[PDB]
Amino acid sequence: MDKFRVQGPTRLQGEVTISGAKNAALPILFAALLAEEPVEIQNVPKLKDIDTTMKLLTQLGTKVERXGSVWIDASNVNNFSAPYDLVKTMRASIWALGPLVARFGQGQVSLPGGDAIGARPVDLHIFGLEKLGAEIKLEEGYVKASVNGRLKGAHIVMDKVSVGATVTIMSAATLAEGTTIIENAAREPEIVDTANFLVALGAKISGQGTDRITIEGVERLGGGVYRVLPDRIETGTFLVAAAISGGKIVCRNAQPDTLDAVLAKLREAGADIETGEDWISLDMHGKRPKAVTVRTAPHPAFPTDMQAQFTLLNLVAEGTGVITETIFENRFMHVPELIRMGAHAEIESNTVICHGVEKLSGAQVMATDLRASASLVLAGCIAEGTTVVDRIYHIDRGYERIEDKLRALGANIERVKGE
Amino acid sequence: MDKFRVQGPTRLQGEVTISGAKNAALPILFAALLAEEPVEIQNVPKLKDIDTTMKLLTQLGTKVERXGSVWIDASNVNNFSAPYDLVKTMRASIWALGPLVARFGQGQVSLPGGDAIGARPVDLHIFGLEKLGAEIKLEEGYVKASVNGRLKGAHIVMDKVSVGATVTIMSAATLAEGTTIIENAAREPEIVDTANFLVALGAKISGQGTDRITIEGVERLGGGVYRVLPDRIETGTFLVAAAISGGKIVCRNAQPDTLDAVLAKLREAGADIETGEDWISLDMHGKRPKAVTVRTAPHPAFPTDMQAQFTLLNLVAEGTGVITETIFENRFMHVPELIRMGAHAEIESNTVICHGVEKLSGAQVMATDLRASASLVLAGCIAEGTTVVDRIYHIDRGYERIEDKLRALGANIERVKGE
Amino acid sequence: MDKFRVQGPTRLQGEVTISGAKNAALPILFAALLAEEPVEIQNVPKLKDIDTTMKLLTQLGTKVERXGSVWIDASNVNNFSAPYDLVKTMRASIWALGPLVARFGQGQVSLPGGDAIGARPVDLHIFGLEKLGAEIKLEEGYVKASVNGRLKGAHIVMDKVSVGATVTIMSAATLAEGTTIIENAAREPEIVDTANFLVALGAKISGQGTDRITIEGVERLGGGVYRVLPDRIETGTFLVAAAISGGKIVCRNAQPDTLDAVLAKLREAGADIETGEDWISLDMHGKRPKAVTVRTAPHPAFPTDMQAQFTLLNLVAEGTGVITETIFENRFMHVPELIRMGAHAEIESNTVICHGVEKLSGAQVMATDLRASASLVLAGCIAEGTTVVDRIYHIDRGYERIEDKLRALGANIERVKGE
Amino acid sequence: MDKFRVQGPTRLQGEVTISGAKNAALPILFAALLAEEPVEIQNVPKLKDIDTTMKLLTQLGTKVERXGSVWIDASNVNNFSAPYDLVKTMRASIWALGPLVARFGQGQVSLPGGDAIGARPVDLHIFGLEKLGAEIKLEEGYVKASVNGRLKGAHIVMDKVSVGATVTIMSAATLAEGTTIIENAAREPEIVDTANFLVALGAKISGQGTDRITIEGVERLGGGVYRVLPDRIETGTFLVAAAISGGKIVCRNAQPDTLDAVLAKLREAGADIETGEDWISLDMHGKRPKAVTVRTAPHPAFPTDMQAQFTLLNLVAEGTGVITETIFENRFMHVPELIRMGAHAEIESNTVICHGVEKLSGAQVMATDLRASASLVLAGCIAEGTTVVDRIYHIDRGYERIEDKLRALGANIERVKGE
Ligand SMILES: CC(=O)N[C@H]1[C@@H](OP(=O)(O)OP(=O)(O)OC[C@H]2O[C@@H](n3ccc(=O)[nH]c3=O)[C@H](O)[C@@H]2O)O[C@H](CO)[C@@H](O)[C@@H]1O
Ligand SMILES: CC(=O)N[C@H]1[C@@H](OP(=O)(O)OP(=O)(O)OC[C@H]2O[C@@H](n3ccc(=O)[nH]c3=O)[C@H](O)[C@@H]2O)O[C@H](CO)[C@@H](O)[C@@H]1O
Ligand SMILES: CC(=O)N[C@H]1[C@@H](OP(=O)(O)OP(=O)(O)OC[C@H]2O[C@@H](n3ccc(=O)[nH]c3=O)[C@H](O)[C@@H]2O)O[C@H](CO)[C@@H](O)[C@@H]1O
Ligand SMILES: CC(=O)N[C@H]1[C@@H](OP(=O)(O)OP(=O)(O)OC[C@H]2O[C@@H](n3ccc(=O)[nH]c3=O)[C@H](O)[C@@H]2O)O[C@H](CO)[C@@H](O)[C@@H]1O
């Protein structure tokens, strides 16, 4: 396994260019399964998740190719199954379900198992599909779906807010008979992006971005060219990178409107933030960040994807911070790792109390999940001495060349195919 | 002191006309503090809470009078405070805050104390105001706010979804200099209703009903005529009345689109439902309800105000149901009371596991919650023998003559005064 | 209703004599139901709760008289039921259950309803009796028990650590045919106190105070005289009164060994402590307390009955404090009351995060818990100006003359007759 | 990286011998560090952890060798540190801390990070040692302890019931100056076990098994011969194995009173059990298990180590069943895996509602926990079809030849390897 070897303390400063959103590219790649014509998705970051998606798409009899773009030829889809291998590697493989059943009348996907950060059930996906008129059964650990002819429009109310289930139900409804109404739908920028992608293809959708999505079924989906939005989570991680290192920074290729809460939290931290129409600028004035209070919740509130990062920010901040996590059950893995580094913290249920310390100490830590890994990398950057982050493979699923981007910021980092 | 005597088991069936929403009439009644001209609010239910707002209003130097409607004249407001006594009996009293300091540059409201259901801080209200330029301080239990001149519109991202704080900020913003953007705003129907009422007065509002409300501060508010929307909770309660009694019912004067989550849940419990534009039809077909799973959350998800009612539904349903509460948490007072009647249930944190039973037994129970404890009267209706619900002043707070409506559905119930 | 008018701030200094424990007196009074001959219980505090138990005993046909002692003659008990009204005034009434069935083969108690601090089910009580051979049915809110012949000893492993259930099962077992083992029994000092009492009556018990209590049933219990232990919560509460007021105090007629957790906690808050066989001295050296961390759990861990008091301590302590409640998840009524007084806290589920402030301010607050009540009176002592605590009926239930005790310490406190 | 291959449905029945308990051998093996004369530890199971423990022992400069028993020679203990690699592969490595600082005046151990089942902080181990006078610092991920001369005994009250912290403080105190008192100590059979081992070495200990452990510091410890006690968890796992299958079983070298809670639950599940001073016999009578309720708490209540095992039982049992976990935050990993097998389960916070299903289908699943692992395997042992369990290394951590044992019990299990 690769590892990162980092040395600090180090002031993170400079310019950085945001990559396409991991969370927009994924659901759009799966949506392409609905397209009968050549498709061109632009601004797709290079990630292990995209690789696994191209690999899975190919397995489905799809024609895939990439650079900054990813060329998709879904005209010939031949197989209808996502093997245990793929789902195991990438949860998002569940996304092939809706499109497959909507276009082909059948589809199978290995029932995901527990996750690093939570049980992560797909109950809502299956449920939405059933509402759409698909027959679903569990066999050999396989979620078996099928429908006779076309899916049927329906008024579906979501139990809880789910990004993934909204993508799943939204996607399949595009090809169904009638009108679909997804109530209590996720408002995530990536939901909007995926809906727009679907509309580019000839779908009838409205309300994307609000708690209510209306879809009018159409005979088929063509093809086109779509540019995935900027990654709000990568952007956030960089703003933070600067905010905890007394540095300054400018984010090129960003979409400020997707991160209001994060920006508000940064300001509450004592950050000097300014925004353009495609750029964000943060300045710490050499100052130490102030502790803030954080409560994760669905968009546009504070995203759970920024959580590990904010904890880090609280850990080297002046004051006592409190972080409450409402989306994921086991999303504190980063904490004990940071303590190993000299941070003071206490966990109580779904909340962690942060007692800011002046400086961090280099140590050997373990990446457990993607966004915590990026938190550990950032911790290494500011901590004293050497920090080695084991299992940086997590980082590589959701981050495109993070070592390089950090390096350009003045980071002392080496990817090590060691020990 | 007021008590309900109920005899069952009794099949609930017939017709019912839904009154005006308590939760829409309250905030509109306080927003009236902004109008410099005679205002008439139509379709106001006759509730103890409405009497209290009237009382609070009068003491502000306000001209108030009611019947079907409530006549308001706030051109002469001289007193700027909500006393301890009123805030005690009536929590919504805090709503006087925003309008007062927006309109007169000042306001005082007693800080609400302990609440059985979950404790309920108003941090969000205060914070919101402060974001608008108001200076706030705590004195002798009173939240004191003031502003030199006019409030300044701001970009406010809510830490959490708050019906109350949203109304406070939305209301006050109508009179500020500039634009106010409320991100992560509550989507409640009563919010659309209050925004609409504010516009009827001369306010510039948009986004009401979505997570992003925009307010263009205007110079002053006039007066007008506005009809309060139907009561969604009262509707669901009656719907549940039929669903738990093998009954059949028709709701007249309803606004179906405000209760999709409740309609969907009911369907899941085996109910045959149909809707028109101002009516809702429910039929159990003599059927005992099917256990279901509930998760309260912000609108349009499952409403915490329907919670105790659904716990009842679960308690006498086939199978094991689960009620999880994310808004109030300690909102399970009805449970032990129902266990007094034969129900089988365990409370684990913010969740109640429901073990459905065939029959309930009449017994003496205690009302405590203004919406929860209508559940005890519903339970009385279908329970074996005689049930006495003490302290019915609770139901009188949120339910307009519930015994008259129940009686017309075929219930054996009598309001025994004093004892 | 009665009330407390308190004026501060006031440093709490002096001596106090600890009363007999409310919590040992109660179960011992109920156990006296098993005695065939006159019984004398010494050191019984004068409390509303003792009044109520006396009333209940009398209704059963018990002969009861009191001063410092309580005189009992249960030789001619003729009635076997605890009525709705009694149980509603004081839940300990459920304690009549076990002794009635074991001795008379029959017993009826009104099923306790919802509680302020938590649902407080009595499933373990009922279950344990059933394990001993009692037949039990729920009729009109009454837990009707009966045992064809004589109770039978059984091996009982408790699902949860329960003071109430351990007392009920233990009392009943004394008259059971055979042997009874209570595995995972509560270790509360009061459990030990009640067990010695039973022994003094001729019962065969051992293990009291440890995880497994063994009871060798006997044909009959006679009479005797028993001296109740000192009230640990009263003791802890006075300790807190000095630890939060930079004062000094000595407790007379105390039992240090029953409060090690509280003592250790106090030390951490920076208190100078000394103890002897029957006394405890607390010296804050004029110092403000250091925020501490608290986790309620079964004895000998930190007692949930000291919880609200430590919350108060954290509230005026230096630093950020954390209070976690594992016995009663809703035991936070006092927090918002304290917030009304200038305190700074956030409630996250079963945990309250305390941010110590320099001073508190007088305000009108409402008592609710026969323990937060005390906390509010303490806060009044150290707060700036005038504090009024409504509903002090609560205090009277758990504290014997708390105003004279405080008064003797320097407290400016007056009992107002309603206004 | 091997993986079990399983096939069913198979009826588990017959006779199995119980190995030494993993939980006693470990801390006992660590207490060895104190023994000046060769010690012979008996009944030690062949476990990955036992090997890793020996490896760790060796590194400190200790003679270690084994078979059925382990030989230790702490005579020439030269080295003072636990290496990152060891602490990483085995958390229990923190155990070497008390012995090192007690016996050698110094001791360093790599700070454990996050755990599979939860954060698992060692705050109590550290805080305790400090009560003993040890100076402790964190440097480079290393917990650094040292003491000027000898550890002074002190009165210590445990914030929480920690088995590990109870072993560490008890162990270190055996060589302390004066008497040590551990209040609110863990009561686990493994503490009784370890305490006995320590006394056997010439140390003064009492209270072991109760909530109060008293230690009188002695001048030094020597050798001896000690036999570890029977593995309660293994016994429970086997008893369950035989209960979920409808079979019969008999455990050898069992010690029944270490598991009263598990036994009673099995009876609630309708299983015919009998005990003898040495052995345990479970007979399902070909009957299917009955859904039960479970709450994990410290010994003697239901152990968390039997949690996953009981979820399985509930999963394939008649009716719904509830399981609540109070010891570990993230201990439901096995659930999603189980669902992959066709089980109906809902997770709510720290509670899992188990909907008993008639049958389980073979499927590929992932072992994650050294306790759930056994759960998946058992699941296969009764599932219709073929089941492959990945990363079965977990089993090897606390399971001596479990495939062998299961096979003797009539199971279709094969340890596939390679790939
Ligand atoms: C590839 C991708 O887009 N990943 C993002 C997506 O994941 P993901 O799509 O999994 O997010 P969801 O919003 O669906 O999950 C949120 C909550 O809903 C629960 N749930 C979800 C679906 C279901 O059928 N049943 C159910 O119980 C979850 O287990 C969790 O407790 O949204 C998360 C929340 O912003 C982000 O943190 C992830 O980075
Ligand atoms: C008069 C009225 O219309 N009452 C309704 C309104 O009350 P209310 O306005 O009080 O509802 P909120 O939406 O504000 O409260 C929701 C959640 O937010 C928390 N919170 C709220 C405000 C704040 O400043 N800080 C904070 O932490 C609460 O304590 C709770 O945990 O919405 C509730 C939820 O839909 C309904 O059940 C009430 O019947
Ligand atoms: C009159 C008296 O002596 N009162 C004390 C006693 O009350 P009480 O006897 O009610 O205390 P319990 O120990 O039984 O209750 C503790 C926990 O067990 C639960 N539980 C209890 C019984 C049962 O059958 N089922 C069940 O689930 C409770 O609801 C709670 O979650 O112990 C409490 C905890 O030390 C103290 O705060 C009370 O002041
Ligand atoms: C090798 C061994 O003997 N393992 C057992 C031991 O582990 P372990 O020794 O780790 O068990 P603990 O009793 O210490 O842990 C119990 C609870 O206390 C907490 N805690 C503990 C120590 C501390 O310093 N701080 C703290 O917060 C824990 O993180 C957990 O929430 O007991 C557990 C509980 O029966 C078993 O499931 C483990 O199989």
The value of Rg of chain A in angstroms is 21 Å
Bound molecules: uridine-diphosphate-N-acetylglucosamine
Q: What is the total tally of β strands of chain A?
A: 24
Strand order of the largest sheet of chain A: 22-23-1-24
CATH class of the largest domain in chain A: Alpha Beta
Specify the overall morphology of chain A: elongated
CATH superfamily of the largest domain in chain A: Enolpyruvate transferase domain
Helix tally of chain A equals: 14
Pairing-aware structural class of the strands and helices of chain A? alpha/beta
What name does CATH use for the topology of the largest domain in chain A? Answer: UDP-n-acetylglucosamine1-carboxyvinyl-transferase, Chain
Quaternary structure annotation: homotetramer
Strand content of chain A: 25-35%
Question: Any overview of this molecule?
Answer:
- 4 copies of one chain form a homotetramer.
- Chain A is an alpha/beta fold and 419 residues long.
- Chain A folds into 2 domains: 1-18 and 230-418, UDP-n-acetylglucosamine1-carboxyvinyl-transferase, Chain (Alpha-beta prism), CATH 3.65.10; 21-228, UDP-n-acetylglucosamine1-carboxyvinyl-transferase, Chain (Alpha-beta prism), CATH 3.65.10.
- In chain A, 31% of the residues lie in helices and 25% in strands.
- In chain A, α1 packs parallel to α7 (189-200).
- The radius of gyration of chain A is 21 Å and the shape is elongated.
- One uridine-diphosphate-N-acetylglucosamine is lined by residues 23, 26, 92, 118, 120-125, 160, 162-165, 303-305, 327 of chain C.
